[PDB]
From a paper:
The Tpt1 mechanism comprises two chemical steps in which: (i) the RNA 2′-PO4 reacts with NAD+ to expel nicotinamide and form a 2′-phospho-ADP-ribosylated RNA intermediate; and (ii) transesterification of the ADP-ribose 2′′-OH to the RNA 2′-PO4 displaces the RNA 2′-OH and generates ADP-ribose-1″,2″-cyclic phosphate. We succeeded in growing crystals of Tpt1 from the mesothermophilic bacterium Clostridium thermocellum (Cth) using recombinant CthTpt1 produced in E. coli. Hexagonal CthTpt1 crystals were in space group P6122 and diffracted X-rays to 1.4 Å resolution. The refined Tpt1 structure (Rwork/Rfree 16.16/18.57) comprised a continuous polypeptide from Leu3 to Glu182, consisting of nine β strands, six α helices, and four 310 helices, organized into two distinct lobes spanning amino acids 1–85 and 86–182, respectively.
The molecule associated with the C-terminal lobe was unambiguously modeled as ADP-ribose-1″-phosphate based on the electron density and the anomalous difference peaks overlying the three phosphorus atoms. The molecule associated with the N-terminal lobe was convincingly modeled as coenzyme A (CoA) based on: (i) the density of the terminal ppAp moiety in the Tpt1 active site and the anomalous difference peaks overlying the phosphorus atoms of the terminal pAp moiety, (ii) the electron density flanking ppAp corresponding to the pantetheine moiety of CoA, and (iii) covalent attachment of the terminal CoA sulfur to Tpt1 via a disulfide bond to Cys46. We envision that: (i) an endogenous substrate dissociated from Tpt1 after transfer of its phosphate to NAD+ to form ADP-ribose-1″,2″-cyclic phosphate; (ii) the RNA product site was then fortuitously occupied by the pAp moiety of CoA, present in the E. coli cytosol at 1.3 mM concentration; and (iii) CoA remained bound to Tpt1 during purification because it was covalently tethered to Cys46.
Numbering used by the authors: 3 to 182
Write the structure that this text describes.
C-alpha cells in the first residue's frame, strides 16, 4: 500500500521548492505535465508503484487542498519558494483574515509586519481554527494574529487566490495586524 501522506510531502517538495531536482520545469502558474512528475518520482524506489490514479487519490484523501490536477497537468496551489514568482490571480480579500504564528516571531512581526520569509507570498487563513493549526506547526501555544485585510487591500496591499482556506498576500505592514 501507498503512504499517501508521505507521497504528498514528496510532491510538495517537487512542486513548491525544488522542481529542478526532479528534472522538472514549472510553468508560470506552477503547472507541470503529470507524466513528467510520475517519471521523476519513479527514480525513487519508494515511489515506483505510484500511478496517475494514485495522485488523484492522494488529493481526494488529503485534509487540505494542496494540489490540483487538470488536463493531465498538476500544480501546487500555494507554498512555493522558487525564484520565479508563481503568477496567482489577484483578489479582493474578506474584511478579516487570520495568521497563526509562533511566540518567538511576534516581536519581529510587530516591528516589520508579516513578510513572505522563505516563500513567495505571505500565507493567511480564513478562520481562527485553521490559523491556529498553522501556528501549531511551530509552537504548542501559537499566537493568533488578526489581519484587517480589506483595509490593507484598500491601501494598496495585494492579495491573491490560494484556495478557500489559504489566502496569499504581499508583505503586510504591521498597522494592519492585531496582536491582541
Ligand atoms: S527516494 C528519493 C526521495 N526524494 C528525495 O530524496 C529528494 C529530496 N527529499 C526530501 O527533501 C524529503 O524526503 C521530503 C520529500 C521533503 C519529505 O521529508 P519530510 O518527511 O521531513 O516532510 P515534511 O514533514 O518536512 O513536509 C514536507 C512538505 O510537505 C507538506 N505536506 C504535504 N502533505 C502533507 C501531509 N499529508 N501531512 C503533513 N505535511 C504535508 C508539508 O507541510 C511540507 O510543506 P513545506 O512547503 O516544506 O513547508
Ligand atoms: N517579519 C517577520 N519576522 C519573523 N517571522 C515572521 C515575519 N513574518 C512572518 N513570519 C513568520 O515566518 C514563518 C514563515 O513560515 P512559513 O513560510 O512556513 O509560513 P506559514 O507558517 O504561514 O505556512 C505556510 C503554509 O504551509 C503550511 O501548508 P501545508 O501544510 O504545507 O500545505 C501551512 O498550513 C500554510 O498554509 C511563519 O511562522 C510567519 O509567522
Amino acid at each position: 500500500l501507498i503512504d499517501y501522506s508521505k507521497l504528498s510531502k514528496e510532491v510538495a517538495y517537487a512542486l513548491r521548492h525544488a522542481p529542478w531536482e526532479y528534472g522538472l520545469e514549472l510553468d508560470a502558474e506552477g503547472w507541470v505535465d503529470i507524466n513528467q512528475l510520475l517519471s521523476s518520482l519513479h527514480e525513487c524506489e519508494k515511489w515506483k508503484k505510484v500511478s496517475e490514479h494514485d495522485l488523484h487519490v492522494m488529493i481526494e484523501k488529503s485534509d487540505k487542498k494542496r494540489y490540483e490536477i487538470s488536463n493531465g497537468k498538476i500544480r501546487a496551489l500555494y507554498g512555493h519558494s522558487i525564484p520565479q514568482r508563481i503568477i496567482k490571480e489577484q483578489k479582493c480579500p474578506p474584511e478579516v483574515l487570520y495568521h497563526g504564528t509562533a511566540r518567538r516571531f511576534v516581536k519581529s512581526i510587530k516591528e516589520k509586519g508579516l513578510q513572505p520569509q522563505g516563500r513567495q507570498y505571505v500565507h493567511l487563513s480564513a478562520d481562527v481554527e485553521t490559523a491556529l493549526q498553522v501556528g501549531k506547526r511551530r509552537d504548542i501555544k501559537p499566537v493568533l494574529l488578526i489581519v484587517n485585510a480589506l483595509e490593507a487591500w484598500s491601501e494598496g496591499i495585494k492579495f491573491y487566490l490560494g484556495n478557500d482556506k489559504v489566502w496569499l498576500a504581499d508583505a503586510i505592514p504591521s498597522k494592519y495586524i492585531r496582536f491582541e
